Design a protein around this nucleic acid. Structure first.
Lengths: 79, 93, 206, 102, 98, 95, 79, 102, 92
DNA sequence: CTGGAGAATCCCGGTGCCGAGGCCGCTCAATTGGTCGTAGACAGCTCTAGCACCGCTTAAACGCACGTACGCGCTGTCCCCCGCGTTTTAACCGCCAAGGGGATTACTCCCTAGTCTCCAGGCACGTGTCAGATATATACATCCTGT
DNA sequence: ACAGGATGTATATATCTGACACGTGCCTGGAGACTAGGGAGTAATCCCCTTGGCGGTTAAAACGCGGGGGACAGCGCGTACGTGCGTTTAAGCGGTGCTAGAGCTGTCTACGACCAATTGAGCGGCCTCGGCACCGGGATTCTCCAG
């Protein structure tokens, strides 16, 4: 608990300014926090599945890369 | 020359779970395309799992992992349960 | 933006160059002449209208200069109280001679400017390493190059669609920084004669 | 003694084993894997046909048409999130009327 | 008091963070969140640090694309200020909520 | 005379229940042959291929109309606009 | 032509299946454009499959594989 | 070597080994890895060309993933190719909406 | 052990295109994973395509049609032209 | 603003027609049974390397007044779009060819698989120095308020 | 509209500094041949089914007209958030330490490949009966002027 609260308000504001957003409502922050928690639940579920398949105890970068591969959200730079 | 679909197998499953329910031929083709789609999904996922761990042998563990990846939560849980049960049956016999 | 006194013995004649921002261009060298290249727009998804004007795959320099002259002749008529007339285009040169009303002969030459990497024959050149620095060499290498036409005038070659490279802006920038010491002709201990002797040689030749 | 009957299943262990061999998925196919995969396919087929049969009973018909397959997949949230990328021909959509229009 | 208009500093922040490329989320709370959710799934999983970096890259780029679509929704509704209904709309069109 | 929208909602209750193709077969098929004639000349079509491609095009447009209607409701309107369609395709990523 | 063969009330019937209560008069031409783009893509990939099989008769299954690789999977015709 | 024999830069032999190892089919034709290494060479050449041109436009002589991001997302056809793909260490396009400006 | 990367080949293509330009290790990782991704996509679609015609031999024609299906229009046309040129040069 | 008026819609129920259910006969593919190597299971031991920890640092998170600027509410306006009519269009259904082209078998023979052997390219390990980020002063670009 | 004091960003200037670029040593997978078979090519063929055309038939497209409700602009104004100022937090970073577990190396073994016989489950054709489509009249569902 409360590590999800570690996603701060000005961090979301920095992401919005990178996203080109001019003004930000006060309820944007908890919504973004929940959406990021859902996205992370999906990716970490896939990563834990890859890790437990590998009979290992250490999550590695390649497992996260293949998790994002089956997500469709394909990332480069870590393989 | 033999178009091998899953028609009689799906029909056996249909008369197993609903003996008073019919099925059209178009719906049978849809279920054939469905089974081929899910088979391609799980088989490609397990193939890539075999290439990740550098094993040349797909076993039930790889199919278990691919099912836990491809399906959503409780459906995957029930499917892993059914598969483990059936592999236990095939191992005991 | 290079006021380019090529003719310092008579500054009343101007050679005003125009730039044109082009896409990336695959270059085909003509006949191993080492300076005459063909302009082929390698690949462009935006479909810029220069490619729409082009013929085949090589950009037609004669077509470009023809319609350029056509637009100039058409538009300089519209100039009021400044007598600008279309002078002869003869001489097998860029031409587009325009006289501004009293001996102000302006020879307009539009030049393509590709911001791409330099061609392979321009590699061992720009020998300002021991003259200025290798770092200034590499920073001038990062600057864009230019394209001006001339048909291959080798005996029988006529109206070929070749393109030779221009280097005017690098030469102007090294005329503004010409000493090994970076304050040359800037403080009164390093008055040199590079600009002096260069103007002496160019005036003597002209 | 067939392997489908040996495991007590419905989907063909021989056909799944043949497709895993000649489908060039790996160099070796362990013998429990087509059993496991036929079991998973049997459960998925049973679940979807269960929901499609319930859709047919809700339309009071004793024959599943593609409309019932569409309604069954798009009503179950887990199978819809599984099969959101799949369009069924002659499927239609769910009864989905916007409340702001009323 | 040299106070700007309420849009100007927003515009220079837009120019800065579209110019910048670094991680905007602070690394250690993101690591705590990842370790929290993975501990919820499988207890005592050690992490490759580059995997956490890759997770942070994917999350930040996903949220930036989401905020672009959210800004397009908010400008589309003759407004200038984003609202969580814009985010719900964008995820419903992408297919995450439906 | 009905209220302007009552028989529209009656049509909505009709066509959400219905499954059949709503585009007329032969103009659509002639359109498909024209678009294929743009790519490669003198092509022959299975009629099942034309029907399946019509299924896919109608289902794609129904999804697009759902998301476009959601956008138009989101802007507190009930009238859909080409602006709405451009928004929907820009969010989907098809342009 | 055939883009006019996509008629105004056919687009209106498609929108009523989608649930649209009110339609502007400029929707129709934009819908013609979107439909034309989508069919250009699908028929492009399907004719590419057809040329690969050294054939001049576009099967249904080629359209199925084109729609599959675009990500719009259709069941019930071949695969 | 076959790369020298095809006049290409990418290793055709490594592509042939990976086609044998990756189990895409049992038999691999001889012109297939030649053609594939050519397609990889053209794609890599065009993307590095756009990246180096953007790096010269930003006066950087070392290619960083920011220039790769800008190069891919400024080509609309490459953007159509790689719309789902995330480049790490990339940032986004400089893109200000016209309603925001004064 | 040994790693299988395309780093020196990307660098050779770079020296062919931008002969005096640097590239970071992270950008090299980007391009390594990119080349693995494009190789994986094209080899997978060639495998699917050969499976569609039940052919057990991936040919250059298979790779050509895989490029035409996967890669978008004008870039695919240029790439097919380059690949065909390279295969014809390999045959000689 | 509640009742009645009427236009439309969902079952009732007969008709009827036509596609799923179901055997029957043929037959390739599944199942059974040895043999073989060898990939995978297992053990052991290194040794990277991930987790905890300090402790200083300073941007950065966090809070708070506040004016303003944008959201929303209200108000009228109007035309653009809904609905019913009134006409015409042409899609559709069925028939009926003519032939293009898909599918199959039948021989074939090149092309890749496979085995062998040698190399030289590819990778690991040094290292020199080069792009970049550091600060730091300075100049060019952009606002915000009074006349 | 125009000038003026900020305020931030870009350009030029030493100084690092860790990572690219280049040499060096190894070593196994490509290369060069050599063979065997088997997939793929090609010829030639059955036959499906597309293309086209046509007649008739009707649901539907197109146009017209009346009008009305929402889009749109404007007035208004209330508050929510940006801007700014001041105030604690804790991320970060280097740094060392402990051992957990990946990774490598070797050592076996049950398991699939492989072949080969043996036969049923599976498919192609074949009847055959209930389910779906209508078509009018009951029964319901539902919006719309007024005292």
């Amino acid at each position: 608990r409360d590590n999800i609260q570690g996603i701060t308000k000005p961090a979301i504001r920095r992401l919005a300014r990178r996203g080109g957003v001019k003004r930000i409502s006060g309820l944007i922050y908890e919504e973004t926090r929940g959406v990021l928690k859902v996205f992370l639940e999906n990716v970490i579920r896939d990563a834990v599945t890859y890790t437990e398949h590998a009979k290992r105890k250490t999550v590695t970068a390649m497992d996260v890369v293949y998790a994002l591969k089956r997500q469709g959200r394909t990332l480069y730079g870590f393989g | 020359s033999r178009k091998e679909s899953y028609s009689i197998y799906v029909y056996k499953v249909l008369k197993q779970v609903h003996p008073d329910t019919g099925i059209s031929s178009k719906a049978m083709g849809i279920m054939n395309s469905f089974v081929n789609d899910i088979f391609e999904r799980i088989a490609g996922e397990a193939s890539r799992l075999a290439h990740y761990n550098k094993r040349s042998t797909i076993t039930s563990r790889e199919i278990q992992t691919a099912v836990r990846l491809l399906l959503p939560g409780e459906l995957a849980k029930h499917a892993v349960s059914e598969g483990t049960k059936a592999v236990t049956k095939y191992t005991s016999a | 933006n290079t006021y380019e006194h090529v003719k310092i013995s008579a500054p009343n004649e101007f050679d005003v160059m125009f730039k044109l921002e082009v896409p990336r261009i695959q270059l085909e060298e003509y006949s191993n002449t080492r300076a005459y290249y063909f302009v082929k727009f390698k690949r462009n998804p935006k479909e810029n209208p220069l490619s729409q004007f082009l013929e085949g795959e090589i950009l037609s320099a004669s077509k470009m200069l023809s319609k350029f002259r056509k637009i100039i002749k058409e538009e300089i008529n519209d100039i009021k109280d400044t007598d600008v007339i279309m002078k002869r285009k003869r001489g097998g040169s860029p031409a587009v001679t325009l006289l501004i009303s009293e001996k102000i002969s302006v020879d307009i030459t539009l030049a393509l400017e590709s911001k791409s990497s330099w061609p392979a024959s321009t590699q061992e050149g720009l020998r300002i390493q021991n003259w200025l620095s290798a770092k200034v060499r590499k920073q001038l290498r990062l600057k864009p190059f230019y394209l001006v036409p001339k048909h291959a005038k080798e005996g029988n070659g006529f109206q070929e669609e070749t393109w030779r490279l221009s280097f005017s802006h690098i030469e102007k920038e090294i005329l503004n920084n010409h000493g090994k010491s970076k304050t040359c002709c800037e403080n009164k201990e390093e008055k040199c004669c590079r600009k002096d002797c260069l103007k002496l040689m160019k005036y003597l030749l002209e | 003694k067939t392997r489908s009957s040996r495991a007590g299943l419905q989907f063909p262990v021989g056909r799944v084993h043949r497709l895993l061999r000649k489908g060039n998925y790996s160099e070796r196919v362990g013998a429990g894997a087509p059993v496991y995969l036929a079991a998973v396919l049997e459960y998925l087929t049973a679940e979807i046909l269960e929901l499609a049969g319930n859709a047919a009973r809700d339309n009071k018909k004793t024959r599943i048409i593609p409309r019932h397959l569409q309604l069954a997949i798009r009503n179950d949230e887990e199978l819809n999130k599984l099969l959101g990328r799949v369009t069924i021909a002659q499927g239609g959509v769910l009864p989905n009327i916007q409340a702001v229009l009323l | 008091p040299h106070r700007y208009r309420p849009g100007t500093v927003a515009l220079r922040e837009i120019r800065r963070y579209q110019k910048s490329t670094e991680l905007l989320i602070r690394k250690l709370p993101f690591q705590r969140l990842v370790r929290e959710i993975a501990q919820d799934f499988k207890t005592d999983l050690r992490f490759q640090s580059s995997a956490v970096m890759a997770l942070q890259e994917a999350c930040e780029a996903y949220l930036v694309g989401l905020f672009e679509d959210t800004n397009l929704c908010a400008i589309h509704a003759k407004r200038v200020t984003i609202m969580p209904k814009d985010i719900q709309l964008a995820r419903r069109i992408r297919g995450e909520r439906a």
